[PDB]
Design a protein around this ligand. Structure first.
Ligand code: RWV
Length: 211
């Protein structure tokens, strides 16, 4: 086992094949512990989950400081934090996976390259190299800074995201809200008048597939 695994891929290879809460260590530093939910089952596992929507119990209409730090219950609905995502994605080349489920239908998107810049970039999104069944709805968002109501699409749609003008992905939108562009949307799968029941965003090293 690795003593200070830097992501859920290093924590998995530690043999641990059950999804749930694990400690990772940013940059392998024992003083930078972070509790994360590891999805150890989806497409070979090793995924740090950083967003989960499943029941509408948690409020995602939150401010910059909340999006920077993270909020919620890692075992249920939560947001890991942009500062965490920046520090994880700085460690190497990561891939993004998005898992969606709504009334029994499932879809996914993988982006071979995923990074989140630091606070001086307003946590700029990079997403490249799409494959999947959900449809490439993140391309629209590529290179955009993060937006909250206090730093306007966030205000106008009551969510938070790497907004442009405004969105094709709104996974931090209002749960069960089928009003145009208000809900948990992935436009190229279910459009803007269909709020998705279940959504996860997760990351792991892009080289995991052949390590
Ligand atoms: C007493 C505290 N509550 C939190 C909330 N959230 C931040 C940790 C995690 C994101 N990195 C999701 C949950 C942090 S410290």
């Amino acid at each position: 086992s690795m003593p200070f695994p830097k992501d859920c891929s290093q924590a998995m290879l530690n043999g641990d094949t059950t999804s749930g809460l694990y400690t990772i260590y940013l940059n392998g530093d024992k003083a930078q512990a972070l509790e994360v939910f590891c999805d150890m089952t989806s497409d070979g596992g090793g995924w740090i989950v950083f967003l989960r929507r499943k029941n509408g119990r948690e409020n995602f209409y939150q401010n910059w400081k909340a999006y920077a730090a993270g909020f919620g219950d890692r075992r249920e609905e939560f947001w890991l934090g942009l500062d965490n995502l920046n520090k994880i994605t700085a460690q190497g080349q990561y891939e993004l996976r998005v898992d969606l489920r709504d009334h029994g239908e499932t879809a996914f998107a993988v982006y071979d390259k995923f990074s989140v810049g630091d606070a001086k970039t307003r946590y700029k999104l990079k997403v490249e190299g799409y494959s999947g069944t959900a449809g490439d709805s993140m391309a629209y968002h590529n290179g955009r800074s993060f937006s909250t109501f206090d730093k306007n699409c966030a205000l106008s749609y009551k969510g938070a995201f790497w907004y442009r003008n405004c969105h094709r992905v709104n996974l931090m939108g209002r749960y069960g809200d089928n009003n145009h562009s208000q809900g948990v949307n992935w436009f190229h799968w279910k459009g803007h008048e269909h709020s998705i029941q279940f959504a996860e965003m997760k990351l792991r090293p892009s080289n995991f597939r052949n390590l």
